[PDB]
Amino acid sequence: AQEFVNSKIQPGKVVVFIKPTCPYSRRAQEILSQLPIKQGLLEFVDITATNHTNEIQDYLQQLTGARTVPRVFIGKDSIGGSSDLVSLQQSGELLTRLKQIGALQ
Numbered sequence: 001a002q003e004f005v006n007s008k009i010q011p012g013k014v015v016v017f018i019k020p021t022c023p024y025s026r027r028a029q030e031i032l033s034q035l036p037i038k039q040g041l042l043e044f045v046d047i048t049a050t051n052h053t054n055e056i057q058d059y060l061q062q063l064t065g066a067r068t069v070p071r072v073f074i075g076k077d078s079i080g081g082s083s084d085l086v087s088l089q090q091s092g093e094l095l096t097r098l099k100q101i102g103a104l105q
């Protein structure tokens with residue numbers, strides 16, 4: 001799983017890796033769902049509807065370090081899992097990461 005995630009994560013683009021089954025990944029879908037992100041800039045990547053599930057997480061691991069669900073990526077910069085994203089949203093550092101790249105409206 002190399003060109004898989006690398007082809008989706010790009011500067012000024014938000015992408016979330018989830019597993020439709022664990023409520024934590026859903027939390028990431030629930031929050032960023034309320035974020036005024038540009039057009040098709042925000043997405044939700046179900047590493048299950050593509051097979052090689054372990055290959056992507058195995059890649060998320062080497063790409064970032066943790067293989068937990070979810071796995072968000074503001075631009076090519078990873079922010080962490082779900083508990084990581086929220087910590088940033090309430091802190092406001094999140095929208096900032098979106099601002100420096102212009103991922104928001």
Ligand SMILES: N[C@@H](CCC(=O)N[C@@H](CS)C(=O)NCC(=O)O)C(=O)O
Nearest residue numbers: 022024067068069070081082083084
């Ligand atoms: N709370 C974690 C995410 C929670 C999570 O994803 N836990 C389980 C699924 S809910 C996990 O990732 N398991 C990885 C596996 O099953 O291999 C974080 O924010 O990093």
